[PDB]
Each structure stands twice: as structure tokens, then as C-alpha cells.
Amino acid sequence: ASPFRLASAGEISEVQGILRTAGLLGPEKRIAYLGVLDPARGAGSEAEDRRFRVFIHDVSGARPQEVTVSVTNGTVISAVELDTAATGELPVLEEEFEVVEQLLATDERWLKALAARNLDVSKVRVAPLSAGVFEYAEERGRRILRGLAFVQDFPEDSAWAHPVDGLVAYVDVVSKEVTRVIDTGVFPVPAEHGNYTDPELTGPLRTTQKPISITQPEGPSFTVTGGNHIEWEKWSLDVGFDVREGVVLHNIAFRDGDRLRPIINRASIAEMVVPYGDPSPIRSWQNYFDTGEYLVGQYANSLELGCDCLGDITYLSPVISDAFGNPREIRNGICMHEEDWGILAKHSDLWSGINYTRRNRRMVISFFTTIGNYDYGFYWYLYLDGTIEFEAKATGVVFTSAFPEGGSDNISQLAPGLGAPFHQHIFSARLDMAIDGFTNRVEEEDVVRQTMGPGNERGNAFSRKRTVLTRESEAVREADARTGRTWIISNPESKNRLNEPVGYKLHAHNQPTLLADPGSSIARRAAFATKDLWVTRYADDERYPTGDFVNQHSGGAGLPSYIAQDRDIDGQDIVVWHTFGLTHFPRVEDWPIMPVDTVGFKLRPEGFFDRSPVLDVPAN
Amino acid sequence: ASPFRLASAGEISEVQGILRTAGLLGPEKRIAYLGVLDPARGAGSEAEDRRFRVFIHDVSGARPQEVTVSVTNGTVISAVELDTAATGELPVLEEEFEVVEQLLATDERWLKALAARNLDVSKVRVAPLSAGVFEYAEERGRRILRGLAFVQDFPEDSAWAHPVDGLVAYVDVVSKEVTRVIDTGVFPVPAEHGNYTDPELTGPLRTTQKPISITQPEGPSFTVTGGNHIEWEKWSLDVGFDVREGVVLHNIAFRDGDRLRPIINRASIAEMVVPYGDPSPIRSWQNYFDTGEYLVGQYANSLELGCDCLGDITYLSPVISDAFGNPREIRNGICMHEEDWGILAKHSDLWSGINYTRRNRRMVISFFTTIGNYDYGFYWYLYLDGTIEFEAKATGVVFTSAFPEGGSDNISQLAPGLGAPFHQHIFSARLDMAIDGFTNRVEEEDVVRQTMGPGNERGNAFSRKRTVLTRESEAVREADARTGRTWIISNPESKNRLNEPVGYKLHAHNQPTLLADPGSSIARRAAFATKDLWVTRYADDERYPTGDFVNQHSGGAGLPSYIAQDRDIDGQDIVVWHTFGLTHFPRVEDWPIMPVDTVGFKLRPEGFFDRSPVLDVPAN
Ligand SMILES: [Cu+2]
Ligand SMILES: [Cu+2]
Numbered sequence A, B: 001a002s003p004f005r006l007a008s009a010g011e012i013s014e015v016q017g018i019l020r021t022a023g024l025l026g027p028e029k030r031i032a033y034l035g036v037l038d039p040a041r042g043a044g045s046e047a048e049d050r051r052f053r054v055f056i057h058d059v060s061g062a063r064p065q066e067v068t069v070s071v072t073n074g075t076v077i078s079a080v081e082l083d084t085a086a087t088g089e090l091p092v093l094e095e096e097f098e099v100v101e102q103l104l105a106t107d108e109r110w111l112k113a114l115a116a117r118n119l120d121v122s123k124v125r126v127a128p129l130s131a132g133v134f135e136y137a138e139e140r141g142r143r144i145l146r147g148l149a150f151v152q153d154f155p156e157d158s159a160w161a162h163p164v165d166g167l168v169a170y171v172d173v174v175s176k177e178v179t180r181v182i183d184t185g186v187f188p189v190p191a192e193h194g195n196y197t198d199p200e201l202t203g204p205l206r207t208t209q210k211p212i213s214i215t216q217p218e219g220p221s222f223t224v225t226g227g228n229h230i231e232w233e234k235w236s237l238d239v240g241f242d243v244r245e246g247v248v249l250h251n252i253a254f255r256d257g258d259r260l261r262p263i264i265n266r267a268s269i270a271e272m273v274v275p276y277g278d279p280s281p282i283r284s285w286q287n288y289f290d291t292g293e294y295l296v297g298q299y300a301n302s303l304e305l306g307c308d309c310l311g312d313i314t315y316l317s318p319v320i321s322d323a324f325g326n327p328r329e330i331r332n333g334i335c336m337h338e339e340d341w342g343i344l345a346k347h348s349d350l351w352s353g354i355n356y357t358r359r360n361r362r363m364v365i366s367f368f369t370t371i372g373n374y375d376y377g378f379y380w381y382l383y384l385d386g387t388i389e390f391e392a393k394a395t396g397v398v399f400t401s402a403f404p405e406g407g408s409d410n411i412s413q414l415a416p417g418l419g420a421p422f423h424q425h426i427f428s429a430r431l432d433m434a435i436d437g438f439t440n441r442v443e444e445e446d447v448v449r450q451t452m453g454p455g456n457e458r459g460n461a462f463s464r465k466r467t468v469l470t471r472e473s474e475a476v477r478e479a480d481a482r483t484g485r486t487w488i489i490s491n492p493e494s495k496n497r498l499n500e501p502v503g504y505k506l507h508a509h510n511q512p513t514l515l516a517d518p519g520s521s522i523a524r525r526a527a528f529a530t531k532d533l534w535v536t537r538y539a540d541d542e543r544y545p546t547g548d549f550v551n552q553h554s555g556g557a558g559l560p561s562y563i564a565q566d567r568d569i570d571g572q573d574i575v576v577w578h579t580f581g582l583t584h585f586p587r588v589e590d591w592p593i594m595p596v597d598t599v600g601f602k603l604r605p606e607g608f609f610d611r612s613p614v615l616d617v618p619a620n
């Protein structure tokens, strides 16, 4: 009955039938995106209407459409034709990936390049990558993918070990034309294999690891009701899933005595960009928007008990649409479990004689996605003490190139002749805040150093200052780790028992933001990634920091255009957008498969409660 | 047989007998520090000599002594009288703590101050705190403690909830004189209790937490031999314990095929300082050097199975000396166990069809200490992939004051009338490096942004630069999170298979360093805390960043005097000293007992191995 429930197979089948009957889903049409729309603000009238947003692509060259459908009423609400040279192309379709390799295999220029290198076309895999927007005027309004080649010596070989450098092709996937083949010269194809399950490479497996058994003899402490509503240790939330964003958390609230207190209305990773820093023309166009261009949710893994998720695991299996509108279940795509998290609080008091120890735990909600060579885990954590944390885990196989004779300033060497270009992995968390309700404000908090002198005669004092961000034009902020800079989201109309506004503090990891030149194409298309924090006024249609149609969009969409409205954000319904990422200079230890590296952020209560919220935790 | 074995009770009893027979341990003497000396460089002659360093205090006013004893030979090696006005006082003795409250209870000025506040002297607890060096000329060469008062309403009451502000006393603990009593005015004593085990405050305990059972049915994967030598998943190390530093890690090495490769010769937390930022004269002198002044190892907790350490736990029970030279065992003072640590590496490959997942784990070595109101956990972690990490966990009860009517820029309000002064908790990790041997160097690595232009026509390139630190005078470095600054410790004479020097990268958390004015007493005495990284040339007697005798030392000892030697550190036996800490603006949620907060650092391999070192991990 909850309006935040997961999309059902029946809902998706109804959408398919509504689109078909309306004449919108002929044999030339493909669904490039389908997802449920969140309830509009002020849905306290019970008039629930399950609506779906659909992007429809046309493989014959006709204009695509954006369509909104009401499943409850069985009607098309709106249908708009899209001019993609203006507003951007639709996300990449899974079926277009195979098109690239097939088209190149019959192109005379591609075959000549492979022949010069003595490569059998049947062994050459082509990575189909998003195109971006660069200098090629003929690409405007066309759906382009770019292809880079890798050799697979046999069907189970890791092709990533054998990049074919000096060669790139561009393909129009609608007209099925190879537009350009660029060959800048022959590089040796690195010969060592990268097969991390081959005993020749692994050696004998260790026999020294004894099992660790994690069990819950009475079952888990959380409950799941209505399919996706979770209650755990005073937390309450709904777990959503969207094919673009992946796991989305709704209605995060904390039961403080008799009051259910809201904290975050909607939390998601709303974009992620992987820009490459190699100036070679073979790769200088390479930038993945995994969320906006590829849709990370549709490549979610099925997670295996004991391997991917260990302990007493509760799974959700979200349903998405395939390209024809058929429901597709991602079996065991979301893992939920609680974990012990060490000591929560401890004190041994000499004067009172009381020894006190309590243990901490966290609730984990996670999924994993695979896009080409990279695999990313998305982890949300809720802690007993009111802390909320996000962690991204990056693994998989690094993207490779040749390593040039005489070295490189922009590529690491991993093996003889094998390089890995420098790159970043940058995320945008969209936090639709609701600290004790929707009237919120953001303050920037810096440490303040004080000079020795009158009122500070021993030169020991230090302080802090808070600056309220009052309008969107002043709410684009940078990190400053040296001054301990954090941001506080507070509710000025809800006070704790000391008459201070209740709040939560955002702690960033203070990693570098986008490194590209500010005049570059990627800086324009991923403007969100150039700054650590943005605050906007909530609006229904401002969903993604990069805009709705990221693929081959010329730039400036999303956050830079939103904040030009210069809206009041001082005690209003606001959204925090936090940029955070990893800068990856690959090391030898990342090859042939990369150990996990992590980045994230957390929010901790700041006078939200009237005292510690974990005094009622028992001594187990 | 190992020279790095823990001190035994028999060794400490022999030291006592040697000191007594030599006439050095009469009834007026107290042992303020006793610890084993590490083997000198080049102990490959098997001529092992177990030597102990002892600081001997004299309660009658005679000069203290530093003494070195050989247990194996039964001899006093050296004994030097100390001029404490020059070189610093000895660490605080546990028995001097009680002296402060007892002396004040009979002092006319103290009793008048308590009478004005209608406080029963029998209910007033006095926190005995280190004195530092300030403006009082009569304190030079005397052992001073300063006392702050708290009311205990009944024997099990938390006195920290009831600070007596406006009042401080200074006590000479050798002559047993109260030198000064300062009363700046009457503040109301905050009346609310802070008793976190009282049902009136906790409410009914939760019944919702179901058990998490962590067991190892075949026992742990590590082995312990010779009392303190650990082998675990290719790691090899010795776990030491010193009464000043606590847990010390020796001889950290990694078994890479047939080679045992050294990484770190000695790792320890060699100082920790807690400076307070309240300019009130009642507290503006307040700075704890928990390691150097109090000795954190002697206040180590006995850790309880199931509460402090959960899982299959192996304990060590280190032995220390009491003030009379009797051995004292800290039962279950060190916990060791392995923990599951999520996904280690994962990839699902479209082209090869191979799905691959491996799990990570870490080895944990930890102890907890309690000094007055604060409790600190020290955690060392070893990971399968070669990562070494340290984490400090801070909990306990925050130090309190009155909250002034009309507010404060330097104190948080926690409860009606109850304040908590701003402060920091700053640690110094001393890392005696041995990356593949003792010839090491440090490079500072910054990200390099590049301008769009020739050779970078699309403005996407970025790079990095490394600067070798060649002499001690250039090896005092600051963090720069915006440029992704890290430090690499490498061995220029040991190369990986790509002919690059092997190395490890230090990743800092980039938290603020010491905030006090640089002209302050604390900035002079804790100079190490003003900079993030120091590199020195190894020397036997350069053990602590603050010098040997920190208590009431006037300043400048330790690292600033060491680096004035300006020694060669480019491919030499070097020591890295890393400053890291927490800046604590107390929140309401920290009261009445503080949930754990953490800070730390980690080191990751950087071309140390020829490929990923965890290819031989099995699929469990
Ligand atoms: Cu990467
Ligand atoms: Cu603190």
C-alpha cells in the first residue's frame, strides 16, 4: 500500500500494454529508461497515483520521446518528442554494445589496421564507449559510440591484458556507419596474459585461511514489511531501486522516544563520472558517466551468499524493464544485513568504580554493478548512534593501454609494455534533506585560530565560525581540510532542549575534485565535479547534477543552470549535492585484478538529540 | 630465545634485585618508568643482552636518576643523576594522584573556597593534572600538579557532571605544599546527574537487538610462537609492550614467495597530546601528554571477552613494574583476532564469461587505556593486500566546565549550565622504516594539473610530481588535501620487475594540526604537532618526538632539536614521524558518555610487489 514500494512486474507489464495500445511501442521502438516517479510534495491526500517515466528510442532514426504513464489509471499522461541535438541523446542501450564490434569487423579501414598488426579479426574485442562532445560537427544529433580494441587469445582470456594502442573508431549506431577510423601508429600488443584464475599466475592457493563463521541464531534485528520498508534499531526507511541511480533511500527517519523524526527525504548517487587523463588522441575523449550514460542499476550483479554477502542476509530482487518493456528480475540484487562494529562507548571510572562497555553495530544496504572492466559496490550504512555513511568500493580490471617506450607522464606501467592511464572516479550524492521536517538551512563551519594577546594571554584558545548559505548563488562551496571545514544542515524552527537548532554535520573525505582544465569539454559536461558542495532549492524536475540526457550533451546542463535561479535556501526545502571521488594513479598491485579501494562521506548528528541516543543499548 | 620477546616477571624481579643491591632502590625511591631497550643496530652477532632503562624518583627531594641495567649479566651499566630544571621532570606517579586531593582537604584557602559554595569537602573529587610550564618562577625544578574540582553526590555518582568552575589549585607533590589557590568567582555547580547506568536516564533498555555470533570452528588463521611472534597470511611481526608507548610492533615483514621482505622495523604511537582551547585562567594551562607525562601503557584495561573483544580472541598479558619494582601483570591487556573485511576483489567479465569474487580479512592487534575521564583504544590492522593501518578510538566522558551565562566562543553547552571546552587529541606515530631493508628515502607526491594547450589540446591531462626529501632540514612537511598530497617511502636499491624502486605510500586523513598560537607554551613543548610529517635519520637515543622527560619541560625538546643536525636521509636508515589528530567541538550527543570517534592513517604498497599479492587467495 506504500507509495514508495518497489515497482512490480505487473506494473511494468501494464506500462508496456499502455504504451503499445497508445501506438508508442512499435517494432522500431526501444525502452532506454523506465522508472517510477516519486510522489509529489504534499501527498498527504492518499490520492496515490503510480506514475512511470519512460525514454523511448527509435532504431529507424525517428525522434525519440519522453513519456509519462499512470499505471493506476491506465493512461498516457504526456508524450514529448525530443530534439537530441538540443537536449542530449538517450542513454546507451545494451544492444548497441554488440553493434560496434560487428560493424567494425566488415569495415575496410578497420581490417587494414588489424592486418598491419597481424591480428585475427575474430580475436579482437571492441570496448564500446560513450562519445562525449568534441570537435566533430557531423556527430551533432547522431548517436555515436567510440571503440577501442583488445585481443582475446582464447575464449576465457582476459582481453584487458592485450590493448591495441594507436587505433580508435567512431560508429553511428543508428545508421550503422563507421564514420572515422584513426590509426596513429603501430604499438606492440602486450603479450603477458592477465588471467587471475590461471594456476601458472596464482601459484598454489593458500591453505592457511581458517573459516570465519558469522551467524544470527535468533535471526536479524531488522524487519522488512511491505516489500521494502525497513525498521532497525530506531531507524525507519524505504529501500528503492531505479535503473539509472541504483539503490535509492527514501524517508530516512529516527524514532526518538514517541516521535518519528525525519532526517533525509531521499538519498541517492545521482551521477558518477570517470574522466581519463591521457592526452593521446586515442583516449583523450574518454569519460564515462556510468549513471547518466549507461544506467548503473541495469548492470547490477546477482550477489552470492557467502561470497558477496556474508552473514544472515536478507535479499531484495528488484524488477526493471528490458528494452521491449518486459519485466526483468535482478535476483538477489540488493543485500541487507547487520554487522558488528566494535566498541560503541566505553569508560572505566576511578571515582565511581563503574566499568561500562557497549558494542556498536551497523545496518548495511548494498549492491554491486559491472560496467565493462570496472565493478563498483555501493554501500549505505546506518549506525546505532545516528550516523549515516556512504561508501563506494572500486575494483575490477583497470583500463589499459600500451606503455610507450621512453615513458609517460600520464600512464602507469603495470607489466612489460602494458600501461594504465591516469583517471578519476567521481561521485555525486544527492541528499534531499528533511532534518526534523522540510525547513532546513546549510551552514559552513570552519575552525578559527586565535592570536596570543588580551583575552588569550597564553595563546591556547581556538574557536569556530559558522556561515549561513542564504541563496543558491553563494551555495557552491569548496573543501578546506586545513581549516577542518564541514557543513551543518539544521532546522532553524526545531530546537533541542538547550534551545539550539537541531542539525546534522556532513564530514567529507576532502579528496581532489575534477582535475581537467576548466575550459575542457568534460569540465563543462561534469560541472558538478569541479566543486565539493552545492545546495539547491528543491524542485520536482531537478533530479540529476548533469541533467536528464547526459549522453552527447554539449554542456552546462544540471547544477550550473539550476543555481542561476538564485533561490532562497535559508530555512526552505533544500537539496545538498556532495561531490567526492578517487584519483587513481594505477600501481603494479592493481594488476591483473584490482584490490578494493574506497571513498565516501558521512553525516553525524549535531545537537539533533538532547543527549546521547544510545544510552538504552544493553550490555549484551 | 627472541631478543624482541616480552619482558618477563622474572626479568623485572631481577632488575629490582640488581637495583636494590646497588643501593639505588631504598625506601625513598620509586620507579617512574621501566622498560626493555631494543637491540642496537646490527645485532647479528647473537650476543644478546637484555637491558632495561629505569627512571628512579626520590620522594625526599634528592635528585632522580636514569639507570640502565643488564639482566643477562646482572650489572648496572650506567646511572646518571638528573637536573630536572634543565632536562625535565620524571613522569607522573600513580601514587601522586591521591596526594593532591588529600593535601587540598586540609588547606585553609581551599576549604574557604568550598565553604563559599556550600560544598562538603568529603564530596569534592580533585582531578590531578600535569602542570606544564607557564609564568610561575617558583615551579622551576619542582614537581607540580594542578587540581580541578568536581562534586560526587554519592559514591557511584559521575563527578564529571558537577564541575566546580572558577577554582584551581597548584600543589608541590614532593614538599607536600599547596603553592597557590586561585578563585576567580562562584559559578553554579551544574545539578543534573550524568549517570549513564541509571534507569531514570537510560529508560527501559532495548529488547530489539538479536545476537551476532562470530566464531572460528577450526581456530584462528594466525599462530603465536615465542610468546609474542605472530605469523598471519604471509605477515610476520613481533608484538611488544612498553609502559610508556603501549603496544609496539617490531619487525613487520611480508613473505613474498621464498623471501621474507621487511617493511617496518618499529611502529609505535610515541606521543599524544590533548591541548585545551579555553582561555579561562582556570583551564588555559591544560594540556595532557598522555604518553610522555602519564605513560599510557600502565593504565591499560583488562579486556573482556564478548564485550571489548568479540570473536575467537587470543590474549597477551604483558608484565610491567610497579613503583617498587615488583612485577605486575596486565591480564588480557592485548586482544588479537582476525576479522572479515568484506570484498577484496571482484570482477564479472562479459568477454571471458568468468565471474570472480574474493573476500578480504584483517588481523587486529588492540589495547585500551583509561586516563581520568578519557578512554582510548589503539588498533593496528594488517590486511591481506599488504595494507597497514592504525586507528585510534576516543570515548569516555568529556572534560567539563560551567557554561557561562551569555555563552562562550570556546566551550560547548551539553546540559543546563554544563559546558565542555574545545580541545584536540593529537597523536604522533613513529615509523622506523625498513622497506626491503634499511636504505630508504621519502618522496612527497602531489597531483599536477595541466593547462589546455599544445600536447593537451582537449584539456583532459593531469599528472603527478615526486620530490625527494634529501636532508632533515627540508623534511618537515605539511598536508595538502587539495593536491592529493601523499608521501612515498621507497628503497632506491631494491627494484621491482619493472625496474622501479619498491615503495609504500602513506595516506593521511589531513585533519587540522595544532591550533594554538605558535608563540604559546604548548606550541613549544609539542612542536611535533604543528606539522604533519617529519623525517629523521635513525639514532638510538631519538625515541620520542617530545624528548625523554616531557613533564614540566620548558620546550624545544625532541624533533625540532633532532632535525637541526641536518643529516642525510636520501637512501639511509630513516624514521618517519606522522602527526594526526581529532579536533573536538563537543556536541550534545557526546554527553553523558561519548560514542566512539576515530582517526588514523594507513600505508599501502606502491610497486612493492610485482603484481597483486592476493592472487593466491582461495574462493572460500
Ligand atoms: Cu580506477
Ligand atoms: Cu575530545
Ligand code: NA
Pocket (backbone or CB within 6 Å): A085, A086, A087, A088, A553, A554, A555
Ligand atoms: Na546542445
Ligand code: NA
Pocket (backbone or CB within 6 Å): A265, A432, A433, A434, A438, A538, A572, A573, A574, A575
Ligand atoms: Na529537502
Ligand code: NA
Pocket (backbone or CB within 6 Å): B085, B086, B087, B088, B553, B554, B555
Ligand atoms: Na629547561
Ligand code: NA
Pocket (backbone or CB within 6 Å): B265, B432, B433, B434, B438, B538, B572, B573, B574, B575
Ligand atoms: Na629506518
